[PDB]
Amino acid sequence: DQLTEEQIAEFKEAFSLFDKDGDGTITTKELGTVMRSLGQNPTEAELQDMINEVDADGNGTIDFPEFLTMMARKMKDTDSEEEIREAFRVFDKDGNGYISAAELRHVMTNLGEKLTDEEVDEMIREADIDGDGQVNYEEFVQMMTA
Amino acid sequence: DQLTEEQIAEFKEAFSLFDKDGDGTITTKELGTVMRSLGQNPTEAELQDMINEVDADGNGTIDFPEFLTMMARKMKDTDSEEEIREAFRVFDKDGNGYISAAELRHVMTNLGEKLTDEEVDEMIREADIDGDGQVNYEEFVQMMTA
Amino acid sequence: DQLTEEQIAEFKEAFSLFDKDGDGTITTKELGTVMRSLGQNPTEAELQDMINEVDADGNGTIDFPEFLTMMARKMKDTDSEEEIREAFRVFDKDGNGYISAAELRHVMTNLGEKLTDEEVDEMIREADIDGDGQVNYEEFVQMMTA
Amino acid sequence: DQLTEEQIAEFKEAFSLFDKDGDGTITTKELGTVMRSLGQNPTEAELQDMINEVDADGNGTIDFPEFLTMMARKMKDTDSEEEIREAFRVFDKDGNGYISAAELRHVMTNLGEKLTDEEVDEMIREADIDGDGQVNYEEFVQMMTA
Amino acid sequence: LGALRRRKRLLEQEKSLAGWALVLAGTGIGLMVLHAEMLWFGGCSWALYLFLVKCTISISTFLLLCLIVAFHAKEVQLFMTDNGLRDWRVALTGRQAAQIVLELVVCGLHPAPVRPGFLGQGEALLSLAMLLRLYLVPRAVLLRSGVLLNASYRSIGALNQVRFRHWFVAKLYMNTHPGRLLLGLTLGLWLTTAWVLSVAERQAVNATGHLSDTLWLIPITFLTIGYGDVVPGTMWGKIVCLCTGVMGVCCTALLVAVVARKLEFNKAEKHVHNFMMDIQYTKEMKESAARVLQEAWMFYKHTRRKESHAARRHQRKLLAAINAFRQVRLKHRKLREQVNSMVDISKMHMILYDLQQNLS
Amino acid sequence: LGALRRRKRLLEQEKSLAGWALVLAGTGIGLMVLHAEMLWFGGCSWALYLFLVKCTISISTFLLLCLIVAFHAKEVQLFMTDNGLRDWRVALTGRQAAQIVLELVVCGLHPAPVRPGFLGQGEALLSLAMLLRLYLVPRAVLLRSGVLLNASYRSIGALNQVRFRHWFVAKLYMNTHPGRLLLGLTLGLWLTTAWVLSVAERQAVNATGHLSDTLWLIPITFLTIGYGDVVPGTMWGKIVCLCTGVMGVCCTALLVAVVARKLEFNKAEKHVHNFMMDIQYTKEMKESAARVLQEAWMFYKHTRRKESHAARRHQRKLLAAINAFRQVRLKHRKLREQVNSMVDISKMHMILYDLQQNLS
Amino acid sequence: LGALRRRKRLLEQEKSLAGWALVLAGTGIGLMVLHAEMLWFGGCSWALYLFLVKCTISISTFLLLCLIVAFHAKEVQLFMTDNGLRDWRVALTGRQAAQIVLELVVCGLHPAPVRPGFLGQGEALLSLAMLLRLYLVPRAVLLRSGVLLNASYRSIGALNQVRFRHWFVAKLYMNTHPGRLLLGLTLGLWLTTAWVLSVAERQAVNATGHLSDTLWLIPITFLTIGYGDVVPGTMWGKIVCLCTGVMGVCCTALLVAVVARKLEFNKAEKHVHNFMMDIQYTKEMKESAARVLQEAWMFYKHTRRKESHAARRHQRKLLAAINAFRQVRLKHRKLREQVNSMVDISKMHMILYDLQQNLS
Amino acid sequence: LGALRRRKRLLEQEKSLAGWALVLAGTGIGLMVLHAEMLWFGGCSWALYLFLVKCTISISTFLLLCLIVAFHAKEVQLFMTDNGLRDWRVALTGRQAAQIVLELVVCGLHPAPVRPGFLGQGEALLSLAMLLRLYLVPRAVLLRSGVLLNASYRSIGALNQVRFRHWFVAKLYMNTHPGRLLLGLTLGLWLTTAWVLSVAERQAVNATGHLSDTLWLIPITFLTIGYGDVVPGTMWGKIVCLCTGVMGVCCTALLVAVVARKLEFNKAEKHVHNFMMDIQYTKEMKESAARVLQEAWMFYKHTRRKESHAARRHQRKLLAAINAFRQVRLKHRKLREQVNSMVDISKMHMILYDLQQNLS
Ligand SMILES: [Ca+2]
Ligand SMILES: [Ca+2]
Ligand SMILES: [Ca+2]
Ligand SMILES: [Ca+2]
Ligand SMILES: [Ca+2]
Ligand SMILES: [Ca+2]
Ligand SMILES: [Ca+2]
Ligand SMILES: [Ca+2]
Ligand SMILES: [Ca+2]
Ligand SMILES: [Ca+2]
Ligand SMILES: [Ca+2]
Ligand SMILES: [Ca+2]
Ligand SMILES: [K+]
Ligand SMILES: [K+]
Ligand SMILES: [K+]
Ligand SMILES: [K+]
């Protein structure tokens, strides 16, 4: 790999604070044990949603090369992905996984500095790559990282 | 209305601390959520009695013109209606929604400054508008506001 | 009565901290309400045993002339009856409502100042009025108050 | 016995903090009462394992000559038996009541000062008295006390 | 119930005999301070009035020495009632008789007349032994308060075993009025101790030790400033200026709790504060999430238009807006943690209310 | 709803009439300190400007005495709105009229012109009665803050019965900014009191009592050092140096809670600290358990080889290793007790979450 | 069980050898202070008695230097019993031998006789090294208390892993008697330190540094007054007056918790206080609700009778009565909130008692 | 993962460039204090060595002014890595460039050589501006600790959102070692401030202001004693003796919590104390209940035998024994209330453990 050896040697003990059984992977139960021993009480849906953000293969569990991609973001100072992922959730009040034209036209007009309702029609027409009428999460990050 | 525009514009956000769903009305559940997030524990009967004081149409729920009449009383310093409504409850120990002649003749004689039991017979005869033998809540406020 | 009038007039409000309903008597429920509002948690057997100490008629409830005999003891400084009633319970470890010869001969010999086991045989022979072989509660107070 | 008389006379009251009923023996319930009144919460398996360490006859309960052997260890400063019994448990991570060759070769090599993996093969061959392939608890204390 | 009417009779009689003893002791101290001052300002021209005030002190300590015996002759008579005694020789213990003799000796000390402005060596300690006639205060404070006789207090105290005494009524008056007590106590100590020190150091020639110096020396010692402009000179001055310093450290460690209680929130006001800061932080998050798109869309606009310096001007503002958004959100989550930490107790009763729905 | 538009109208008008009264009172104090200083540094050469400043103080206290009446004529007019009155004679109580007369007397005191550098005996107390025109501050602070008029604050405060007043907004500003307030308050007291003391003790011949001495005397008295290089001389100096000492003890007992809050852990940071010390202590236990075998096997080795001094060398190290292992384990169990003691509350909600699985 | 009779035998022998060492060290300090004083007050006329007291100090430090070796020869003999050793060379570690040598050096220092009233430069530091023979106190305090040998204490401490040591018995004596300890400790420090300072600064000609000055300098420094009438002059005086000030700040921060504990209510007394204030506030509400009708009915009476000034007189009293009723009710609800906030814990056990009725 | 190897590379390089900057700043302050002292003790005979030390200060501040730029050229290079930038003009903000310019100005101030023992007016403030090169300390303390780079700390801190910064590592070192830090901080302030004050007040003729006076003036001011034997004379002395007093009040309000924590019981030791006092009070109750019968039976014995004075002798002892029994029992019930109040939390988990038996 591009990573050195002693860094892998020190990420192994970071992985074995979660993987207590030594099975080679992390489930929601081993995560919830650490989350409760740190003093906070998640729900099952919250734990499963924390798993589903970094599960690349889609097996429902996290192994060590998936753990490295998670620790590549939480090691630096400003995790620029989460601060856009939750600014997407500040807009999506209905929780449908979409930003409609009405949600965007409600937020960007009255709050900010006097932005027109004509510019929102150009912005929504530029944002919808698939032509789905409204703004997804996938196009929302591709607009940020352009 | 007689009220100005910016005041309606600022009562709308006061109404939308209760009406979280944006349905246009307030039920006992949305009230109880705010009441529990403020740290006190009402019962269902207490919440329903808080609703029934300002429900004008009688639908079991509160809309915004009913909310304005509630905020017309809680905005000023001394809410003169509640301080008579609960001085009515200090007398009505049996909770029957009535002040009998015995309750009034018990309280006003021994406590106060030496009031006669002959004056209570004139007071109860003047107070009972309907001739129901005892003092209602409706005549009790009409005696205060005479 | 031998008691004066204003003292009865002030014991009436002391009785009406317990008799909240104004029924004329005190049950275990009205006692337990005050006992829990003072911050301690009795059991049903403890409340019933507190009732049975001053219930003279034997009706299971306490009225006001029974309340006066209770307040004739708790008004003075050293309630000399309770401090003998529980010194009787310090001996009766088995809880049978009796002090056997073995319990007395265990306590009075090793603890105190070197009292003989010959004096205990004279004491138990003098104490048993009914000839029941062992010391009751009724003879125990009649020995104290001789 | 080799012990003097007044020491037995003072261990009797130490035994009668546990044996509250005066039955002549200690069960897990009388132990758990004291353990909970001291403010800690054991489980049934933990209490039974605390009983099984000093139960010599194997009756499931503890009498006074078994209590004396327990107090012969907890009276001195450093109980040298427990500090080896739990250093045995630090190794046995699987909890099987055995130290395998892999557990020993994992712990003694990487942690300590650079101990070889050739010495572990001589140590395990010397330790297994019964030839059971792995290190028991009985041979582990006989190696310490050699 | 003849042993309950007589108890209230004797207890009212002791309230009267504990009021009049305190009046006749305050009169003795008030006529002692007058003698000690008109011996100083007067000299030997007023010897008639000095003898008259000394004899009046002797009379008003004789009547105090009679009323203390009249109080204990009611307390023994009460103890015989409460236990059904008839022979008074059984009731009067040894330690109580020793207490009576000590209590009569302490109220017996006064500057009695035996037959140029300083006091003597003996009639300055007898005069400052009059201040030990203030054990009569907590007795009269207890017996004048109704809590020893009010039936509802005694019944509720007997259910809870609290045993009404002096340290209970002291905590009553200290926890219902911490202001009047702590102010009128220090303004009754900074004048009594200022008079005692201005007895302990009087200088005739220069007038360098009277109340004009001690009313400045004692607050300065009490607050632990200690300038050093005035310093006590005798040995009895140096004892009193250490007692004042010890009382000052103790009353500072007393005031440090009373001021700690008052500035904290009421329990109902902190919830209003948190519930308003929550909807302020929601408004700030919804501002900042619009700032992020307001910069990112202009960045995409000038990215397509290839205005390169405008792209390098707006990408910097994009990064600054994300940096502001993270800080606002981390204020918001700390405040939501303060909310979730405080309403845990109501959450317990709420989960028990949801467990109350499991009977049918 | 005509009694709700008029209420906001009158409340905005009172906010304006409570801003302008504070401006015209600050102008009066600022022209008072200027008169008291140019009478000292000037003498009798500037009598024209002294008369001019005195007349300007009279004008700018006349307009204050008009605006206070204009504020109470809005507050009575508000109280008539809130209760539906029409005859104003019903609204104006006796205690409120007494408050108005006292409030007009207190803002009436000023050094008025009747017609060598010291002040008079009367125009130095009228000049130091201008500082009692600072009851206008909490009135203007309350009415300029929006909490008396903002609808969401009033509705949430009416659900919880908190009654917004001066001591609520004081706790608001004290619990949102404990730093700016406690610094700009002591740096506004150590200059006001330093000016008042440098009025109370001016010495003409030697220049030994002005601000250069009082700006050193007052922080030293406030912090309860009290060197004694400078000591107040008059009686009005000795009153002020006791008020400063009392305020210093009170602000020390105030700062002792603010510093007590800040150095403690955040609730979320203590769990990270404990969860890291746990896996440090596990590593130390696994080191020490290997040290024990490393010494015991060498002891058995030299026991078989009968190297006697090596056996007596390694048995000592075995006993020392067991002694170290016990101490590491007893650190570990104390820390596990700290963990099991703090997360009891989350354990309660966890057991209730496991009891939530009992419906079906 | 031969290793349990011998343990109690050796532990009683160490209690005796820890009592006699403390007696022979207190004798050494008591004969040191006598030598240092009769060298000052005596001079060179009493050289025989100075030599005699120095030789007695040498004898009563030789027997102390023997009893410390006799104590460690029992402690090694105990450590060999507790672990089953036979060869004593295994038991005696290196750090324990270093402790023995240091402990013999520290109790070896004394003003030994080598062969006008000041001490020397060396025999004033050897004489003030005798005060380092007070490490013998916590050893004897631990071994004379029964907690190291009492079987029930050891069994309950072994169930809970508490490990009885010096800091446990210190907290025992500090939490059973905070008064005797904190008074007889400061009255044992203000005389020891007053003697050490009156060694550090003796002036022969003027007699300006002895105990009459230091017994006033040290309480004044301890309470952080610091007048400045007496000030230490040497360098060894200035070290001691900083150690006293540090101990004074620490004992103030110690007394600030002991006084904080005592003035608060007992847990059972606060419920009696709240339950009585509840039925006082109910009586005040029932007074005020009658005041409201007493004014409103007279207002309706004079409204019908059209006595207009009586109507404007009673409507004002009606509004004042409503204003009083609101304030009484808002006191009542705050107190009911204090009640509902404190008995939440008993409410938890009560709801669990109502959940206990769900088995059948 | 090329943006994760480079991050550890740059972070190690910044740890080296934050160690060497602190070394080259400590060398500058250490060569500044040497110049300021050998100008005083030397005069004009050592002008060569004064010029040499000034030029060495200029060299060892030039290399510091290079290493600060070399540290920010790694921090911008790290910020470009963490966000995927390529053009460095986007990364360098305005506030960060202002921080760099201010940080280079502050480490630029030094007594540079322009070409009888006092310093100048300008080269005494440039020399005392070297002490503002101690912002380099928390930077190096953060980067040398492993918590910014250790992976397990960062993962557990990211699960709990704690954001490792300077105030976290300060609380780490303050809560793992409150003793070393609070002692070696005050013994590093009482020498730095003692040198700064002994710059601010040097008197040439009498030698009345050097370190021998300031090492006594500053602990006395810090502990708020303030004798007044030495008092600062200039204006810069009076600023420093107020800063020391403010830091003394703050460190007293800091030590008042550290001493409050330590003297309280451990949670496991209080249960052992209560469980032993319970079985002591049971033994005292069983003594007193035997005393009651021991007197009552002798009273009945002499009642039958009609020995009247023996009856009046033993009835008094009977009443005294009942009086003792009540006091012992009321100690016992208060202690049982302390037991029932503390183990309520374990009682909650015990009742939930008894509710755990309700599944089948
Ligand atoms: Ca796993
Ligand atoms: Ca996966
Ligand atoms: Ca949406
Ligand atoms: Ca709704
Ligand atoms: Ca409706
Ligand atoms: Ca009714
Ligand atoms: Ca009833
Ligand atoms: Ca009955
Ligand atoms: Ca029995
Ligand atoms: Ca048993
Ligand atoms: Ca057995
Ligand atoms: Ca194993
Ligand atoms: K001072
Ligand atoms: K001083
Ligand atoms: K001081
Ligand atoms: K001080």
* Closest of B76, F268, E242 to residue G217, by C-alpha: E242
CB D76 within 8 A of CB G7: yes
User: Rounded to an integer, what distance in angstroms lies between the CA atom of residue B87 and that of residue B99?
Assistant: 12
**Rounded to an integer, what distance in angstroms lies between the CA atom of residue C100 and that of residue C124?**
9
Give the resolution to one decimal, in Å.
3.5
- How far does residue H323's CA lie from ligand 12's centre (Å)? 65
CA distance F174 to E265: 11
Is the CB of residue H251 less than 8 Å from the CB of residue H223?
Answer: no
Q: What is the nearest CA distance from E354 to chain A, expressed in angstroms? A: 18
Residue B135, beta-bridge partner list? B99
Q: What are phi and psi of D62, to 5 degrees?
A: -115, 125
Kindly state whether E315 is in contact with chain H, defined as any CB-CB distance less than 8 angstroms: yes
DSSP summary character for residue C99: B
Contacts of F223 (CB under 8 A, 6+ apart): F248, H224, H242, H245, H246, H248, H249
Q: How far is the CA of G273 from the centre of ligand 12 (A)?
A: 62
* Chain gaps in chain E, named by the residue before each (C–N > 2.5 Å): 115
C-alpha distance from D82 to closest chain G C-alpha (Å): 12
Please name every residue paired with A99 in a beta bridge, in sequence order, or none if there are none.
Answer: A135
The tokens for A41 are 């009480």
- Breaks in chain B follow which residues, C to N over 2.5 Å? none
Tally of helices (H runs) and strands (E runs) in chain E: 13, 0
Residue A64 lies in domain:
5-74
Nearest by CB to E1, which of C2, C17, C40? Answer: C2
The Cα–Cα gap between G40 and G199 comes to 10
User: Closest Cα to residue H18, out of H100, H139, H170?
Assistant: H139
Contacts of H134 (CB under 8 A, 6+ apart): H25
Distance CA G171, CA G305 (A): 79
Between chains, do F154 and B4 touch, taking CB under 8 Å as contact? no
Which neighbouring-strand residues pair with B62? B26
Rounded-to-integer distance, Cα F349 and Cα E351, Å: 9
Pick the closest to residue H65 from H110, H107, H99, H24 (CA basis).
H107
Burial of residue B59, with CB atoms counted within 10 A of its CB: 0-12 exposed, 13-18 middle, 19 or more buried: exposed
Burial group, residue E334, by CB count within 10 angstroms (0-12, 13-18, 19+): middle
- Find tokens 């040097």 and name the residue: H202
Residues 6+ apart with CB under 8 A from A61: A25, A26, A27, A51, A55
What approach was used to elucidate this structure?
A: cryo-EM
From F247, F242, F135, F246, select the one nearest F197 (Cα to Cα): F242
Indicate the burial class of E36 (C-beta count within 10 angstroms; 0-12, 13-18, 19 or more): buried
Write out the H or E segment, with its range, that includes residue A116: none
What is d(CA E315, CA E300) in angstroms, rounded to the nearest whole number? Answer: 10
Distance, CA of H302 to CA of H312 (rounded, Å): 10
Hey, how many other C-beta atoms are within 10 angstroms of the C-beta on E91? Answer: 21
For residue H63, what are the contacts with CB-CB under 8 A and spacing of at least 6? H24
Instruction: Please state, in angstroms and rounded to a whole number, the distance separating the CA atoms of residues B121 and E263.
Output: 52
With a CB cutoff of 8 Å and minimum separation 6, the contacts of F31 are F53, F56, F57, F60
For CA atoms G331, G332, G337, G338, the dihedral sign is positive
- Measured CA to CA, the distance from residue H346 to residue G355 in angstroms comes to 18
| Contact between C98 and C92 (Cβ < 8 Å) | yes
Number of C-beta neighbours around residue H122 at 10 A: 10
Long-range contacts of A94-99 (CB under 8 A, 24+ apart): A97/A136, A97/A137, A98/A132, A98/A134, A98/A135, A98/A136, A99/A134, A99/A135, A99/A140
Residues comprising chain C, all counted: 146
Tell me the C-alpha distance between B76 and B74, whole Å.
6
DSSP state of A26: B
Name the residue among H152, F354, F347, F280 with its Cα closest to residue A18: H152
Contact between B75 and F159 using a beta-carbon 8 Å cutoff: no
CB E245 within 8 A of CB E222: yes
Give the C-alpha separation, C12 to C64, whole Å.
Answer: 8
Residue among E322, E296, E325 nearest A123 (CA): E296
If one counts every other C-beta atom within 10 angstroms of the C-beta of residue F131, the result is: 13
Residue F335 burial (10 A CB sphere; 0-12, 13-18, 19+): middle
**Cα–Cα distance between F103 and G212 in angstroms, integer?**
58
**What is the spatial distance between Cα F213 and Cα H231, in angstroms, rounded to a whole number?**
14
CB contact under 8 A, E259 and F253: yes
Please spell the DSSP secondary structure of E81-123, one letter per residue.
HHTT---HHHH--HHHHHHHHHHHHHTT---------S--SST
CA distances from E135 to E74, E183, H147 (A): 18, 21, 64
CB C83 within 8 A of CB H288: no
H helices of chain H, in order, are 2-40, 47-82, 88-91, 94-106, 136-144, 151-160, 166-176, 178-200, 211-222, 235-262, 267-305, 308-342, 344-355
C-alpha–C-alpha distance, residues B131 and C8, integer Å: 39
Cβ–Cβ under 8 Å, residues G41 and G120: no
- Nearest to residue F301, comparing CAs of D130, D139, D123, D135? D123
Please enumerate in sequence order all residues whose Cβ is within 8 A of that of E193, keeping only pairs 6 or more positions apart, or say none. Answer: E218, E240, E243, E244
Residue C115's contacts (CB-CB under 8 Å, 6 or more residues apart) are C108, C109, H294
DSSP D42: -
Beta strands (DSSP E) in chain B are none
**Helix, strand, or coil here: F108?**
coil
Q: Which residue has the tokens 């050293």?
A: C78
Q: Which two tokens stand for residue E134?
A: 């203030």
Please, what sign has the CA dihedral across residues F152, F155, F157, F159? negative
Of the residues E82, E317, E319, E330, the best mutation for testing chain H's interface (the one with the most H CB atoms within 10 Å of its CB) is E319
Helix axis angle, H47-82 to H2-40, nearest 10°: 160
CB A46 within 8 A of CB H52: no
| Residue E162 touches partner G, C-beta closer than 8 Å | yes
- Look-up: residue for tokens 């009796």? C98
Residues with CB in 5 Å of ion ligand 7: C 19, 21, 23, 30
How far apart (Å, rounded) are the C-alpha atoms in residues C98 and C100?
6
Report the amino acid identity of residue B112. G
Question: Is A14 in Cβ contact with H151 (below 8 Å)?
Answer: yes
Length of chain A measured in residues: 146
Q: Tokens for H253, please give them.
A: 């309000």
Find out whether B84 and B95 touch, Cβ atoms under 8 Å. Answer: no
Q: What angle do CA E309, E311, E317 make, to 5 degrees?
A: 110
**Phi/psi at D135 (nearest 5 deg)?**
-95, 125
Based on the number of CB atoms within 10 Å of its own CB, is F313 exposed (0-12), middle (13-18) or buried (19 or more)? Answer: middle
Alpha-carbon Rg for chain F, nearest whole angstrom, is 36
Residue found under tokens 């809410």: B79
Q: What angle do CA E104, E108, E110 make, to 5 degrees?
A: 160
Q: Which residues contact F242 (CB under 8 A, 6 or more apart)?
A: E219, E220, E223
Q: Which residues surround ligand 9, an ion (CB under 5 A)?
A: C 92, 94, 96, 98, 100
CA distance H150 to H158: 12
H83 interfacial to chain E (CB closer than 8 Å): yes
> How far apart are the C-alpha atoms of E284 and E272, rounded to whole Å?
19
**Gap from CA of F281 to ligand 6 centroid (Å):** 70
Angstrom distance (rounded) from CA H62 to CA H110: 10
Q: From the annotation, which residues of C make up the binding site?
A: 19, 21, 23, 25, 30, 55, 57, 59, 61, 66, 92, 94, 96, 98, 103, 128, 130, 132, 134, 139
Three-state DSSP state, E162: coil
Neighbouring CB atoms inside 10 A of H238's CB total 19
Residue D66 in marked binding region: yes
Please, are residues H202 and H232 in contact by the beta-carbon 8 Å criterion? no
Give chain F's largest Cα–Cα span: 118
Which helix (H) or strand (E) segment is F31 a member of? helix F2-40
3-state helix, strand, coil in chain E (%, to 5): 80, 0, 20
The verdict on whether residue D138 carries a ligand-binding annotation is no
Query: Does an H or E element contain D57, and which?
Result: none
Strand, coil or helix: what is A99? strand
CB–CB of F299/F311 below 8 Å?
yes
* Structure tokens, H23: 């070394």
Distance CA G227, CA F223 (A): 15
Q: Which two tokens stand for residue A95?
A: 């929780």
Nearest to G275 among C38, C40, C41 (CB): C38
Distance from CA of F190 to the nearest CA of D (A): 54
Residue C28's CATH number: 1.10.238.10
Those residues with Cβ within 8 angstroms of residue C75's Cβ, 6 or more apart along the chain or in another chain: E4, E7, E151, E154
Q: Which amino acid is at A131?
A: G
State the sign of the Cα–Cα–Cα–Cα dihedral F123, F129, F133, F134. Answer: positive
Query: Helix axis angle, E267-305 relative to A101-110, nearest 10°?
Result: 100
Chains within contact range of chain A (3+ C-beta pairs < 8 Å): E, F, H
Helix axes C5-15, E2-40, angle to 10 degrees: 100
Nearest Cα neighbor of H294 from G263, C46, E208, C115 is C115
What is the C-alpha separation between H354 and H360, in angstroms, rounded? Answer: 13
Q: Please choose, from the candidates F254, F197, F188, the residue with its C-alpha nearest in 3D space to the C-alpha of residue F221.
A: F197
- H or E element, residue G141: helix G136-144
Judged by DSSP in three states, C136 sits in: coil
Q: Three-class SS of residue A56?
A: coil
Residues 6+ apart with CB under 8 A from F179: none
Burial of D29 (0-12, 13-18, 19+ CB in 10 A): exposed
* C-alpha closest to that of H279 among E348, D34, F18: D34
Two structure tokens written together for F262:
């800040």
Residue H222 CA: distances (Å) to CA of C92, G293, H193, H217, H242: 65, 65, 11, 9, 9
